[PDB]
Design a protein around this nucleic acid. Structure first.
Lengths: 221, 119, 249
RNA sequence: GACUCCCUGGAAUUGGUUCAGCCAGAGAUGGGGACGUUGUUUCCGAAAAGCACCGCGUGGUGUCUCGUGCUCUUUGAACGGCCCUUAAAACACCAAGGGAGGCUAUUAAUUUGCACUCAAUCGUACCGAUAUCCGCAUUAGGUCUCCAAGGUGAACA
RNA sequence: GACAUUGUGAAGAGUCAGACUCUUUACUUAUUCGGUUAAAAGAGAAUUUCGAAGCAUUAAGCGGAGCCAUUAUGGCACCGUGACU
C-alpha cells in the first residue's frame, strides 16, 4: 500500500470547503411555459372539482385498461401499408372496425348501436366529451373513461381521438367483449349514484398538511 | 428526472442547418463595374502635376471616388504595366478624387506619361 | 395659475438625485442557508465616505459558498467597526458590535441598526448617522419582537428579521452650524435640487396659494386637510396641532 | 534620481529632522545597501543640417569657453490645509495565486534576434474678426482657447 | 357604500323551515407586496469565534464492475459513495 495515497476528506459545513455539485432541481428557475404547466396542474388539484368534471379523473385501472386495449387492437382501421397494398390490387381489379369521433359516437349511442364506448380521460377542451358519460348511461350503453386520447389515437392510427366505440364484434371476441362490459359496468355504470355526488379536488400541499398536523398535535398536547 | 446541478435553465442547443435554396434569388451575379477602366478616369495635366512627374517620378490621375489605394495600385499596374511604391489620395473641393502614384525606381514616370499622352 | 414647485418635483427632471459618485446602496446580504442555519464570516475591507450620506459605508468581503469567488457587500458602518475586522452574519452569530443577527436572539434593551422592516428586505430602518433602534420586548409564542424606532415609535416585527448590533457611525453631525450659505449649497449639491427655498408669501398668486397681496401675509389658515388637491396641499398638512410644543410630545 | 524599502545593532543625560511638518523598543541615530518614473551627457542621430560671414561664375572659414538667480512659465518630487463638499465609467494591457496540461538530455515543445509584406476610409486650402462668423452691412456690439522680450516697478498694473 | 373579481373550513347570534343572514376566526389556490444569479423550504432518518486583514476552484479516499497492448506488467476509462431519504 503506497503511503502517499492519503485520504483528504472535505468538510462541507458552513464556512468550510466550497459546496459540491448537489441536486437543485426543485430550486431551478424554470421557463414560463413549464411554470404555467406545473402551476395549472397544482391549481386543478387544489380547487374543488364538481362531480361532472371529477368523473373523468377516475379512469379504468391498469389491468382493465390493458384488457380493453387488447380487445380494441383486434379491429384497428386499415393501415397505410395495407392501403398501399390494397390500392393497386383494387385498381387492377369493410369489416368491423373501431369507430371514432365525438359526433359519430354520439349518433351511435343515441341510436343504441354501440356496444362499448371508451372516452379519453384527458380531452381538452373538456366540453367536447362532457356529455358522453351521461348520454351513454341514459341510453344504457356500456361506457368507460380510459386513460389516453393519444393511446386511443394510436389504436385508430391517428394522433389523438376523443372517444371510440365498438359497434359490432366477431364471435371469437364476443366473450371478450362481454367480460369487458361486465368489468366496465362494475366500476362506471352502477356507481352513478356515487359518481353524481362525489366532489374532487381539495387536496392541499404536503407542507400545508404538515403544518396542520403540527398544530393539531400541539393543541391536543 | 434529469438531475440538475445548476439553478439556471438555458435554452437547449438545437441543430442549425445551412441554406439550401430551391432557386437562386438573383439569376446571375452582378458584374463588377469598378474595373480598371472605371478606376482610372483621366490623367491630371496641370503645371503642378507636370512638376510632380518630372521631379518625383510621380504620376497624377483623376480616379473614381469609390476606389481606394489598393484599387488604384492594381489598376495602374494593369493599365500601364508599372509598379507603384506609394499612392496618395485626396478629394478636391469639387468632389473629385485625385491620386498621386509614385512609381518604383525601375520605371520612369516621364516616359510613362509620354507613352500615355499627357505631356 | 401655474404649477407650483411641489407639483413640478414629481416629473423627475432637474429634481433627480445626484448619484454620479455614489458608492452603492447600503444593504445586508440576501438571506440564505448560511445566515439561516449558522453564520458566515466576512472581512471589513474598507470604510469609505458616500457622497450625499452622513454615515460612512463599510465594504465587507464574503466568500461565496457555492463557487470560487468573493462577494463584496456595502452597508452603513456601525460605530467602532474598523478595517480588518471580522463580521459574523447569521442566526448563530454572537452579540458583538457589527454582527448581523436576527432580532429574536437579542436581550431587551439591545441597541441595533440596519433593522429589517420585513424578513429579507436587507435592512431598511435606522440607517442615518448616529441613529439606532432598541429591542423593547419579545413574544416567543407568536415569534415576534417589539422594537423602538429612532422617531420614538414602537413597531412589531418578526423575530427572524435581521439587524446589525450597534448604532450607526458618524453621530453628532447635526451639532455644528452650517454657518455659511455655501456650506448648505455644497451639502445639497451632493444630494438633490432642493435649495435654496423661496417662501410662498414672497411669490405671486399665480405660483403659490400664499402669494400676492399688498402685504406679505398668508391670508388663509396654513393648516390644510389631508385630501386637498395637488396644487393646494401646501403648509402644515393635516396638522393635529400648531404652535410651540409645551410639555412632552 | 529627494521619496520609499532592506541588513547590522540596540537608543533617557532621548535623539534625528523640515521653510512648515514630523519620525523612533511596532526598532531611532550611526554604518552599509536596493528601487524608480522626471532628467543629463566631452556618446550615436550630427554637422554632410541650420545659422553667420568671406569669395568666385561652384567654393572657403567659424559655429567656442564659462557664470548667475526670493526671476517667470512648463514639467517633476515631496509634503501640508479644507469639506454636514471627499473629488467618473468603460475598453484595453499587465501582474500574481493556481498547476489542469505539454516536450522528453545533442531530440522535441519553446521562447530570442535578424531579414521580409502590409497598414483601408473620411477631414487637411484660408478667415477666425473695428471687413471671410452672428447682428439686413466691409455694423465702435457679441463670440471658446495656446505661445508671451527689455526698462521702471511688488507686479501679466 | 353596493355589485363582480371572490374560493375552502369552523364558532356565535338572528331568521326561518336543511337552508340564508350577519359578527369573529382559520386555510391557500385567485390576487397583492418583497428577496434572490429562484442555492439547502417542510417532513423523516441518523446523532467556523481566545472576535488573528493568510489560501480555499479544475475530489482524494472507499466499493463495484470494464477496455487496450505484450498470467502478470504497463496505459485508459466508467458507475456508486464521499455529498442521508
Amino acid at each position: 500500500k503506497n503511503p502517499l495515497f492519503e485520504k483528504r476528506a472535505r468538510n462541507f459545513n458552513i464556512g468550510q470547503d466550497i459546496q459540491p455539485k448537489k441536486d437543485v432541481t426543485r430550486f431551478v428557475k424554470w421557463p414560463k411555459y413549464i411554470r404555467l404547466q406545473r402551476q395549472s396542474a397544482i391549481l386543478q388539484k387544489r380547487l374543488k372539482v364538481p362531480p361532472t368534471i371529477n368523473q373523468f379523473r377516475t379512469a379504468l385501472d391498469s389491468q382493465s385498461a390493458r384488457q380493453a386495449f387488447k380487445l380494441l387492437d383486434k379491429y384497428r382501421p386499415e393501415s397505410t401499408e395495407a392501403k398501399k397494398n390494397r390500392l393497386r390490387a383494387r385498381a387492377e381489379a369493410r369489416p368491423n372496425t373501431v369507430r371514432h369521433g365525438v359526433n359519430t359516437i354520439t349518433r351511435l349511442v343515441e341510436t343504441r348501436r354501440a356496444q362499448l364506448v371508451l372516452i379519453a380521460h384527458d380531452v381538452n377542451p373538456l366540453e367536447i366529451v362532457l356529455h358522453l358519460p351521461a348520454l351513454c348511461r341514459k341510453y344504457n350503453v356500456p361506457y368507460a373513461i380510459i386513460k389516453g386520447k393519444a393511446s386511443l389515437g394510436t389504436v385508430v392510427r391517428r394522433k389523438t381521438t376523443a372517444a371510440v366505440a365498438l359497434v359490432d364484434v366477431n364471435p371469437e371476441d364476443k366473450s371478450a367483449l362481454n367480460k369487458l362490459v361486465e368489468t366496465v359496468n362494475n366500476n362506471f355504470s352502477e356507481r352513478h349514484e356515487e359518481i353524481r355526488k362525489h366532489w374532487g379536488g381539495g387536496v392541499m400541499s404536503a407542507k400545508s398538511d404538515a403544518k396542520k398536523l403540527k398544530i393539531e398535535r400541539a393543541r391536543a398536547r | 428526472k434529469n438531475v440538475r446541478t445548476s439553478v439556471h435553465f438555458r435554452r437547449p442547443k438545437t441543430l442549425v442547418t445551412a441554406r439550401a435554396p430551391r432557386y437562386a434569388r438573383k439569376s446571375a451575379p452582378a458584374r463588377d463595374k469598378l474595373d480598371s477602366f472605371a478606376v482610372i478616369k483621366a490623367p491630371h495635366t496641370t503645371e503642378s502635376s507636370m512638376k510632380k512627374i518630372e521631379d518625383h517620378n510621380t504620376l497624377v490621375f483623376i480616379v473614381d471616388e469609390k476606389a481606394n489605394k489598393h484599387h488604384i495600385k492594381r489598376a495602374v499596374h494593369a493599365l500601364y504595366n508599372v509598379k507603384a511604391v506609394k499612392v496618395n489620395t485626396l478629394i478636391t473641393p469639387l468632389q473629385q478624387k485625385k491620386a498621386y502614384v509614385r512609381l518604383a525606381s525601375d520605371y520612369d514616370a516621364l516616359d510613362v506619361a509620354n507613352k500615355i499622352g499627357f505631356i | 395659475g401655474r404649477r407650483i414647485r411641489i407639483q413640478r418635483k414629481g416629473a423627475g427632471g432637474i429634481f433627480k438625485s445626484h448619484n454620479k459618485h455614489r458608492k452603492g446602496a447600503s444593504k445586508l446580504r440576501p438571506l440564505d442557508y448560511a445566515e439561516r442555519h449558522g453564520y458566515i464570516k466576512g472581512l471589513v475591507k474598507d470604510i469609505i465616505h458616500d457622497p450625499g450620506r452622513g454615515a460612512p459605508l463599510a465594504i465587507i468581503a464574503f466568500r461565496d459558498p457555492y463557487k470560487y469567488k468573493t462577494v463584496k457587500t456595502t452597508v452603513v458602518a456601525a460605530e467602532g467597526m474598523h478595517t480588518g475586522q471580522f463580521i459574523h452574519c447569521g442566526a448563530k452569530a454572537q452579540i458583538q458590535i457589527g454582527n448581523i443577527v436576527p432580532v429574536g436572539t437579542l436581550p431587551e434593551g439591545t441597541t441595533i441598526c440596519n433593522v429589517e422592516n420585513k424578513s429579507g428586505d436587507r435592512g431598511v430602518i435606522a440607517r442615518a448617522s448616529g441613529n439606532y433602534a432598541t429591542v423593547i420586548a419579545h413574544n416567543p409564542d407568536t415569534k415576534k419582537t417589539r422594537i423602538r424606532l429612532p422617531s420614538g415609535a414602537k413597531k412589531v416585527v418578526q423575530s427572524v428579521n435581521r439587524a446589525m448590533i450597534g448604532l450607526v457611525a458618524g453621530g453628532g453631525r447635526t451639532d455644528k452650524p452650517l454657518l455659511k450659505a455655501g456650506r448648505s449649497y455644497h451639502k445639497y449639491k451632493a444630494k438633490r435640487n432642493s435649495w435654496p427655498r423661496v417662501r410662498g408669501v414672497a411669490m405671486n398668486p399665480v405660483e403659490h396659494p400664499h402669494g400676492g397681496g399688498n402685504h406679505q401675509h398668508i391670508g388663509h389658515p396654513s393648516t390644510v386637510r389631508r385630501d386637498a388637491s395637488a396644487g393646494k396641499k401646501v403648509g402644515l398638512i393635516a396638522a393635529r396641532r400648531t404652535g410651540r410644543i409645551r410639555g412632552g410630545k
